[PDB]
Design a protein around this nucleic acid. Sequence first.
RNA 1: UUCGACGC
RNA 2: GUCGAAUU
Length: 395
Amino acid sequence: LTYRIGNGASVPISNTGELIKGLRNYGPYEVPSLKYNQIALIHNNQFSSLINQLKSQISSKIDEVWHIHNINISEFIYDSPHFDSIKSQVDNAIDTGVDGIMLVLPEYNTPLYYKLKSYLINSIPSQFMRYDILSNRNLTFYVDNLLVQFVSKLGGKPWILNVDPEKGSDIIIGTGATRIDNVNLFCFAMVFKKDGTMLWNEISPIVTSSEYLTYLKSTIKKVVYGFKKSNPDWDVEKLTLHVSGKRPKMKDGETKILKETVEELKKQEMVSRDVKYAILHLNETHPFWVMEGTKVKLSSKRYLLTLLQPYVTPIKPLSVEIVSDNWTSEEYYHNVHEILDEIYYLSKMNWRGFRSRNLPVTVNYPKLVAGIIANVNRYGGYPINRSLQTNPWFL
RNA sequence: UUCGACGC
RNA sequence: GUCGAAUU
Ligand SMILES: [Mn+2]
């Protein structure tokens, strides 16, 4: 229903102009804390008007929308549009003392994006931009969205979902794997609060399909060990797994391993030894047109949650299957409503820009990682640190 | 790579 | 390549 921003304010969802005006008035839910109060802009068009306007917009929005005050932006010019010359300005910036780097790429050069991006994820919060894509017409839409994600990557919290703290899971784990070609894959596991904020993330190395279940288990254990070490008193009595991704087909073996992993985390006191949990498969299914937030039951274990398209009335359904749960027959229906509601609230959380993705954050954010992991691997960049664990570097 | 959507 | 980004 509403987004919680700063100073105790809440603004309706589904209205980006009201969210922006809200941030100008009250601030974000959390301003990032900075060490230098300095950010670098790195580019190769020193007399460019578009870059001039870009700098001045970033400067005024950072202060006025984001309430990050007195930041200095320093500029660094590179003079050849290739890896070693840009990297050299990047290095100059990092030696200067900066909280993050905004890097304007020159043209369209995919190997160069992945090479530079993998070096920076490893170093310092960064936000790329394309010189060719700038225009006066779209500059304000462009900077508005760009800063939602750069503020997050600097450790800020734009807005969180307003949810009933008595309803839903204590934590939600988005987990699964994504195949990056026909043989190789990586596992992921991400812990969320019910308010849609990411608490911790782990990704496995790239492995082969034969190694899927082995790394699925360990990646999930690492992410919970991580969450628990930085939240020792967060009791988990209600736990939900959101399983997603193009991964090997292996559903019974996979459910058995997920069940085992929760039984080991109980033994190790990472969750309650009487935790109530459900393991769910979330799958995007083919769109359709009515010629909603609606919950459809297809069988006692298969459900559909229908959502407007984030763009006849077009609908993007999300399939939801309960593959395992330890719920009582009595609790059952009630729990089904809560878990479906929660999936709907999470589908409204997106720190990539102002517009809702209408896809659950637990499904969406692992897709964003996958794109980077796949292409870094393909273009031979630097493989992707408690900093990367708590920060949404993939946005 | 601000992002999205279409068409091929 | 074709639009679009308060009001989805
Ligand atoms: Mn991004």
